Structures are given as structure tokens and as C-alpha cells.
Nucleic acid binder design. Structure first.
Ligand SMILES: [K+]
Ligand SMILES: [K+]
Lengths: 260, 141, 129, 184, 146
RNA sequence: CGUUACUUUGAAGAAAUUAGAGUGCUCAAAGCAAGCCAUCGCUCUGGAUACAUUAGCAUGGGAUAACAUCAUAGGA
């Protein structure tokens, strides 16, 4: 190619979007923004496929051009805006607030949150280093730069950001024993506590996580997001509570529900 | 099988099960060791030293009495041959055949046997170079 | 030359069992042959066997009980994962009810069922049924 | 009164070991053959264990370089020490170091005389020293038992006739292998 | 002794003509020879720290960084200026016949003067930026054949 | 402060295709829908899972096997 791609073929769209195969030749190509294209949930999908507010592309445009949707406290009119993990989606007309979390099957789920709980997001620190003028600055995986961060904050940390004031109100150090959520790979959406961190020089670092029921899983450092200090996450979790179920137990639940 | 013939002989010596000296052996260990040293001093090779210690002395097997092998004992006292004995004998055979062919040109059979002898020499020299009992650049011509 | 002592042991045992002999002598002896013979004895396919020490490669005298149909080696010792045990047993065993494939595993020398029980793969030594 | 026995490291000698040491001290200059060789005698450890033959047996450890001088005086000492403790078949077995097998992350040559096998064969040779080993046979029974059969020399039969079961028990405890003895 | 070129050869960003020379300072400071640990658990050879050679492609005293693959092998050729051929030997599995065949790969690697190597030595190379048309590796450890 | 093969487990190995869970498009090939006594709504509805040579990364194992050594140990 002689430049950037503008189109996303529907077959080549992320599989967690759960787009259907015959809905068209194309999928919404996510715009550049805070989250990666392959790891985000675009606004058009949230509005039409998930919340059912809109029925068409044009209806999503109509809703967004009314300035009805705020992402993390700010009005977005781009339909392909890449909304991502832990983002607050608020509609200050119906009075509903949503935190974009992962279910245990790797798919973004709009989790309803309280009005007070929609006043902060959780960000993962990507790096800490000196900017111009020798001023220390923090950057996250959701594209934010924060200057003069707390010196106790290091890379891979989780900071609590107040959307109203745009400051770090609290932070969590990436340590063994902190409850985490996996945001990438086959364990996406799984919640557990870190048991040990296995480091290997020159290559990716492996984190060993054990969930509440005792199942153990391992994932790379880049796919781990701390959500609480200790065994108590700072945000509310979806109904699964991050506890992945085997297909046999899912069938048990379905059989019990049908029997009732 | 013979390496360079179809002969399938199985004639060989059979060492006794008892690895300790028979009670009738009374020669002290140092005695047999210095006997070996004199034997190598005239120029005998370990095979001949063993033969003489077997048939002219009350020593059935050196290893049973002393606890070591003849070549090891000679190496300990610095009398081991430079070229290993089997290679020495093969080279002697090769030079004898080469002299005979320098007198006899029509002897094609002896030429074939010389080819076999030199093949054996190359095999054994390769093994000795790999085991570092020969100079790394040791060459036969 | 002697390339596989296990093959000679198993082939001599097979020939002796076919001949109706009640004793077969194995030479040379080896730890792998004694370990294969222990598996064979555990499954009841042979009786007593005796290692004879001759200050060399040993000898084994095995009692035969007429329960052997065939024992053989697989050469080469192909790498067999736990998942390929089914294919190997289909290839080599008379039925899914009887017969054993002997594997060399880092957990030890064992039959394929015991290898499944510990989920350990390895290399195939042979078979007997 | 603390010279004949020397623990490898400064261990407290068990009471039976001190009794054996006292017996050695009282037997130093008893006889002409009891002296002129007992000067270079040193014992590591002596323990006493019961045997099935209704008697009892005592083993004697040795620093392994006076082993042969010990062998030369083995028969006489066996008599004397047995007289010192009648009903206690006395066996004189040297002390050998069994080393753990080398790992892949090691380049040690691990002398084969320090491996467990060679140690056990040396031990079995030392425990029946008045007799000589003519043949070794190992039986693998159906239940997995590994019973070892050793053929002793037909000569010295009476010299090693009633020590067979005590030898079996000694090799059972200090080595851990089932053992029976026969005569060609 | 090392000035064998038509140009002076200096370590970049090291001031040799400094007036306030000092030996207790870190490498590259006060006219000290610059050197670095390559990381990845590899010790810096003492002949690189005490050397007088100037090699910009040296992993320990040059400007190259070791990042990417770490490959073992055997010195197959050492007839080039500071560059050797590393032969890697490996088994290629043939699926249909369930067997293996022997295959080899010739990897050019830059070798710094801190190592002396001969054909047959066991070497450890680490991936670096392209140093020439065919070279993307730097010798990091040399084990003699004996 | 000897490697490697081999094996085990883990992470990856796009989607679509394949295998396969659910679901009465009237059936079916399909599709990823839908279902609920009828509900100004609800089921957080569902939109699983498996497979994926070889090569690469990591974990445990060392039986089998390969290579390198393997009495100046001149050992500590
Ligand atoms: K391009
Ligand atoms: K002969």
C-alpha cells in the first residue's frame, strides 16, 4: 500500500465485537485515539449493536451529533472513537453511566456504575521519565500524559484518575497479592490475585494469577491490570466476578435455569 | 567379523571370574612393578611384558596382582612408547610390505594387502588422534 | 554388529515361546531389558527371570509361562506424546482390551496405560501381548 | 582410653562403641599376634543388631586405608573380639563414601568407586571376607522382590557356615538388599 | 598502536584531551576508556575494559546494543577482519517419514578484539543492528574447543 | 558458573473455513440469532469451546539418545 488503510473488512474485525458474517462487507474501522484499534469497542458498536439506542449507521450519527454521549466526561461526536477498557461512558440525558470492562469470555461489557463511581477511571502507568525542562511526567496505556506524578509511582502501576479534576487521587503499586484483571489473551476478563512474578532478562515477563475459587493461570505483564489493593478491587465487577467457568459448569447453569 | 576378511573366528582368551590374585601368587606388588620397568627398559612392549610375566613368572595377570594395567604402570614411571604399540606393529607391517613391493612390482596381491594395512593404520591413527594419544599433526607416509 | 540388545532379547524370547521352550537365555543383559522384563512380569506375561553376573555384560534366564503371543521392539524409538499413544496402540496392539506398548519416559520405563495415568510421554521401546 | 576409636567428626561414641573400644584396649597386648599390628588400628563406628538366627551381630567400620592390615588380622581379631563379646558374630567392613549422581550442570568425573553399586559390591566382599565370591545371581520374583544369590567358595565353608544368616541381616541393614548364600 | 588507519580512531563522546583527568570516575568520563555491560547475564571481558583497541561495533566498548536473538554455534571461519562465520547445526524434522535430517546455517557475526577465536570454538552471539551487508550479530562469549 | 534432542505444562499461533455448544430460519442447506401470557418491558439474553505441523518463548522431568569432555583431576 501507499499509505494508511481507511477501511476495515468485516471478516478482519476484532472477534470480541461479535459482528455477524453477513451484515456487510465492512466493519467500523476505529479512529485513532486513547486505545488500540484491536483492543477497543467503537462508539457506534456501543450505541447500535449493544445498547440498541440506534438501529443504523446514520442513526448513530444522529445520536452522537446531538452531543448526547460523553466518554470519560467529554463529549465525543466521532462514531469510531476507540472506547476502551475502564472507560466511563455516560449519557447525561437518561442518567446512565457505563464502565467498559471485560467479561470472562474476552468481550467488552457495558457495566452500569453509580454516579459517584463514574467520577473516576483506573489507568495503567506505561512509563515514568523526565520530559522537557527536566519535569517528571507519567504516561498511561490509554494515552494520557500526567506531569508531576507522585515519585512513588512507577511503570506498570495503576492510578486512580478523577475525571472532574484530572488528577491522580490514588494509586496502586504493582505488587504480589494485588487483585488484577487480565485485559489480553485467552484469560481476558479473568480476575485474581498475583501470586508471583517470574522475570526473564531480555524477554516478556510472566505473571502468575490465582482467582478466588483457586484456579491458577499465567499471562504476560502487558496483559495484567491492577484493580485493587489486596483482595478488594477498587471498581465493581460484572456478574461473573471475573471467575471463568468451564463449559461443563456453564451447561450446569443452563440446565438449572431451564429446570427452574 | 574380521574387519578386512570374511573370517569369523572366535578364538580368544577368557579371563577368570575371580579378579583377585590366586593364593599361590606371593610376589609383592612393587616387585612385579619393577620387573615391568626392567622389561620395558630393554624395549619390550606391554603385550610381550605380559607374556613373559605369565609364562616365566608366577604372575597370571598383572591387573589382578597390582590392581593396574601394564600400560598404565609404564605411563606412571615414564616408559610408555611414543607411538602406541598396535600402530607401531601396523606401521612395521606396512613398511615391510612396501619394501617387498619395491622389490616385487608384479605382486598385485601384496598391493591389495598393503591397501588393507594402510586402511587399518588410518583407522587406528584417527582413533588415537581423537583420544589424544598421538600428536594432533601426526602423519603416516 | 549388535545394534539393539533389546531387539535380540525380545526376538529370542519370542522364538523360544513359539518353540514351546520354558526357559530362554538372554545375552547381553542391560538395564533396559531388565526394566522391560519387569513390566512384562508385572502384567503376568512371563515368570521368574534371573540375572547371571559374569563380570561382563550379564545373562538373563527367563521362565516362560506360555502366555506370550508376541513381543517386539520398535526401531527407531519414535517420540510418542501422550496424545499419540492412541494411534500407536491402534497400529501395534491386537485390540483395545489387551496388549501393552512399552515406553521410555523421564518418569521411567513403563507401559502405555501407566504412561497415560501419569500423563508422561517419551519414546517407544516396544510391545508385547 | 579414647584412642582405638575415632569418630569421623567429633561425634559422641555410642555406649556400645565405647564397650568395643574398651575391649580393643584390653586386647592390644594380649598375644604376640595381638600386638605389632594393633598399633596401626583405628575404628570409626561399631553398632550391634539382632539377627534371625537368635544370635546378634556387630559391625566394625574402618578408615579404608588400614583395611588390608585389618584383613591380615581379620581372622584372629574376629576370634578374639568374638571371645570379647561371645554370641556377637563380629564383621569388619570398611567405610566408603557414596556420592550423589552428578547433575547435568556439573562436570565432575565422579570416581566410579564412589558410586552406590561399586560401594555395595565392595561392602558385600568385605562382609564375607573369610570366604570368596565365586558367583553372583539375582532373582526377580513375581511380586517385584529382588533377591540376590551369592556363591561362596567351597573352601572355607566351615569358616563361613553359621555366619550366613548374620551376614544376610548385616547386608540387609547396612546396604538394603535381600541376599542368600550357597556353596557350589 | 591501535592507530592503524588513515584516521585517528577514538571512542565517541570521550574527551581524551581533558585537563582534569581522573581514574575514579565512571567509564567515558575524565578521559577514561568507555565500556558497558551488554546485559543478559554476560560478563564484560577484562581485555575490553583494559584494551587499547577502538571498535565501534564492539558490544562492550562500542556503540552497538545487543537486542533480539541469542544464538549459540561453532566458529566455522575466522579469515575476515573482525568478522567470523558462525555455523549453527540443527535437526530438521521431516513430517512424512517421522525422521530428522541434519541442517546447518552460516551466520556472520562481528567479533571484537577482546576475543581471539579459532575455527571450531563454541561461540555465543547476540543480535545487534545491521553492521554490514550480511552481519547482524556480535560475539558475546567464546569457549575454546579444548 | 556442560549443552541438546525428547517429553510435560503454560502463553501465543487473525477472522473466515473445519470440528463442535446453544438456538424449530415451517424442515434443510443456513444464519447468529433469539426467548418470555403479550411485558411502555424483562432474561446482566446469547453471540461457547476445541483444533492449529514446524520454528520461536517459558515451566517441570532426565528414562532413552546425541555432542563435548572424561589421571599434569595434578582435585579441593
Ligand atoms: K507499503
Ligand atoms: K587368535
Amino acid at each position: 500500500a501507499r499509505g494508511l488503510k481507511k477501511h476495515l473488512k468485516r471478516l478482519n474485525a476484532p472477534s470480541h465485537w461479535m459482528l455477524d458474517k453477513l451484515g456487510g462487507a465492512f466493519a467500523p474501522k476505529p479512529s485513532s485515539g486513547p486505545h488500540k484499534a484491536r483492543e477497543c469497542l467503537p462508539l457506534i458498536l456501543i450505541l447500535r449493536n449493544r445498547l440498541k439506542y440506534a438501529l443504523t449507521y446514520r442513526e448513530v450519527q444522529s445520536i452522537l451529533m446531538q452531543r448526547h454521549i460523553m466518554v470519560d466526561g467529554k463529549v465525543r461526536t466521532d462514531k469510531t472513537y476507540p472506547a476502551g477498557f475502564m472507560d466511563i461512558i455516560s449519557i447525561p440525558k437518561t442518567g446512565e453511566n457505563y464502565r467498559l470492562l471485560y467479561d470472562t469470555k474476552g468481550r467488552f461489557r457495558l457495566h452500569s456504575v453509580r454516579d459517584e463511581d463514574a467520577k473516576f477511571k483506573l489507568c495503567k502507568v506505561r512509563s515514568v521519565q523526565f520530559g522537557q525542562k527536566g519535569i517528571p511526567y507519567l504516561n498511561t496505556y490509554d494515552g494520557r500524559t500526567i506531569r508531576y506524578p507522585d515519585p512513588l509511582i512507577k511503570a506498570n502501576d495503576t492510578i486512580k484518575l478523577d475525571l472532574e479534576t484530572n488528577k491522580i487521587v490514588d494509586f496502586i503499586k504493582f505488587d504480589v497479592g494485588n487483585v488484577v484483571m487480565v485485559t489480553g489473551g485467552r484469560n481476558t476478563g479473568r480476575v485474581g490475585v498475583i501470586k508471583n512474578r517470574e522475570k526473564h532478562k531480555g524477554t516478556f515477563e510472566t505473571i502468575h494469577v490465582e482467582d478466588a475459587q483457586g484456579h491458577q493461570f499465567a499471562t504476560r505483564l502487558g496483559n495484567v491490570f491492577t484493580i485493587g489493593k489486596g483482595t478488594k478491587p477498587w471498581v465493581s465487577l460484572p456478574k461473573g466476578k471475573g471467575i471463568k467457568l468451564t463449559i461443563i459448569e456453564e451447561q450446569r447453569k443452563r440446565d438449572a435455569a431451564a429446570q427452574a | 567379523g574380521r574387519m578386512h576378511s570374511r573370517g569369523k573366528g572366535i578364538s580368544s582368551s577368557a579371563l577368570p571370574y575371580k579378579r583377585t590374585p590366586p593364593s599361590w601368587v606371593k610376589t609383592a606388588v612393587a616387585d612385579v612393578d619393577e620387573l615391568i620397568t626392567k622389561a620395558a627398559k630393554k624395549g619390550q612392549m606391554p603385550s610381550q611384558i605380559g607374556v613373559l610375566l605369565r609364562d616365566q613368572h608366577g604372575i597370571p595377570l598383572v591387573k589382578s596382582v597390582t590392581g593396574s594395567k601394564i600400560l598404565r604402570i609404564l605411563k606412571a614411571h615414564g616408559l610408555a612408547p611414543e607411538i602406541p604399540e598396535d600402530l607401531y606393529f601396523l606401521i612395521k607391517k606396512a613398511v615391510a610390505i612396501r619394501k617387498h613391493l619395491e622389490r616385487n612390482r608384479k605382486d598385485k596381491d601384496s598391493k591389495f594387502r598393503l591397501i588393507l594395512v594402510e586402511s587399518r593404520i588410518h583407522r587406528l591413527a584417527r582413533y588415537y588422534k581423537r583420544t589424544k594419544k598421538l600428536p594432533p599433526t601426526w602423519k603416516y607416509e | 554388529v549388535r545394534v539393539s540388545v533389546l531387539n535380540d532379547a525380545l526376538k529370542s524370547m519370542y522364538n523360544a515361546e513359539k518353540r514351546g521352550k520354558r526357559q530362554v537365555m538372554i545375552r547381553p543383559s542391560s538395564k533396559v531389558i531388565i526394566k522391560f522384563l519387569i513390566v512384562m512380569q508385572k502384567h503376568g506375561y512371563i515368570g521368574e527371570f534371573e540375572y547371571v553376573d559374569d563380570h561382563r555384560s550379564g545373562k538373563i534366564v527367563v521362565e516362560l509361562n506360555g502366555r506370550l503371543n508376541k513381543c517386539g521392539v520398535i526401531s527407531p524409538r519414535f517420540d510418542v506424546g501422550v496424545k499419540e499413544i492412541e494411534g500407536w496402540t491402534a497400529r501395534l496392539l491386537p485390540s483395545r482390551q489387551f496388549g501393552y506398548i512399552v515406553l521410555t519416559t523421564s518418569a521411567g520405563i513403563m507401559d502405555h496405560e501407566e504412561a497415560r495415568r501419569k500423563n508422561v510421554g517419551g519414546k517407544v521401546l516396544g510391545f508385547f501381548y | 582410653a579414647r584412642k582405638k576409636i575415632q569418630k569421623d567428626k567429633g561425634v559422641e561414641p555410642s555406649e556400645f562403641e565405647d564397650t568395643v573400644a574398651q575391649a580393643f584396649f584390653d586386647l592390644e597386648n594380649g598375644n604376640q599376634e595381638l600386638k605389632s599390628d594393633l598399633k596401626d588400628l583405628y575404628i570409626n563406628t561399631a553398632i550391634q543388631m539382632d539377627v534371625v538366627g537368635n544370635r546378634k551381630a556387630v559391625v566394625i567400620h574402618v578408615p579404608y586405608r588400614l583395611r588390608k592390615p585389618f584383613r591380615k588380622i581379620h581372622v584372629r581379631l574376629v576370634r578374639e573380639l568374638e571371645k570379647k563379646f561371645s554370641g556377637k558374630d563380629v564383621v569388619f567392613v570398611a567405610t566408603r563414601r557414596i556420592v550423589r549422581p552428578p547433575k547435568k550442570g556439573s562436570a565432575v568425573q565422579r570416581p566410579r568407586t564412589r558410586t552406590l553399586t561399586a560401594v555395595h559390591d565392595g561392602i558385600l566382599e568385605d562382609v564375607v571376607y573369610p570366604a570368596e565370591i565365586v558367583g553372583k545371581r539375582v532373582r526377580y520374583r513375581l511380586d517385584g522382590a529382588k533377591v540376590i544369590k551369592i556363591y561362596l567358595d567351597p573352601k572355607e565353608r566351615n569358616n563361613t557356615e553359621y555366619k550366613l544368616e548374620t551376614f544376610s541381616a548385616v547386608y540387609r541393614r547396612l546396604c538394603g538388599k535381600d541376599v542368600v548364600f550357597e556353596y557350589p | 598502536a591501535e592507530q592503524t588507519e588513515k584516521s585517528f580512531l577514538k571512542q565517541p563522546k570521550v574527551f581524551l584531551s581533558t585537563k582534569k583527568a581522573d581514574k575514579a570516575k565512571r567509564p567515558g568520563k575524565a578521559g577514561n576508556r568507555f565500556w558497558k555491560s551488554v546485559g543478559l547475564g554476560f560478563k564484560t571481558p577484562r581485555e575490553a575494559i583494559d584494551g587499547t583497541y577502538i571498535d565501534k561495533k564492539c558490544p562492550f566498548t562500542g556503540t552497538v546494543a545487543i537486542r533480539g536473538r541469542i544464538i549459540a554455534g561453532t566458529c566455522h571461519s575466522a579469515k575476515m577482519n573482525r568478522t567470523i562465520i558462525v555455523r549453527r547445526n540443527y535437526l530438521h524434522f521431516v513430517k512424512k517419514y517421522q525422521r530428522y535430517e541434519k541442517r546447518h546455517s552460516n551466520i556472520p557475526a562481528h567479533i571484537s578484539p577482546c576475543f581471539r577465536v579459532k575455527e571450531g570454538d563454541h561461540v555465543i552471539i547476540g543480535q545487534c543492528r545491521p553492521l554490514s551487508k550480511t552481519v547482524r550479530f556480535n560475539v558475546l562469549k567464546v569457549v575454546p574447543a579444548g
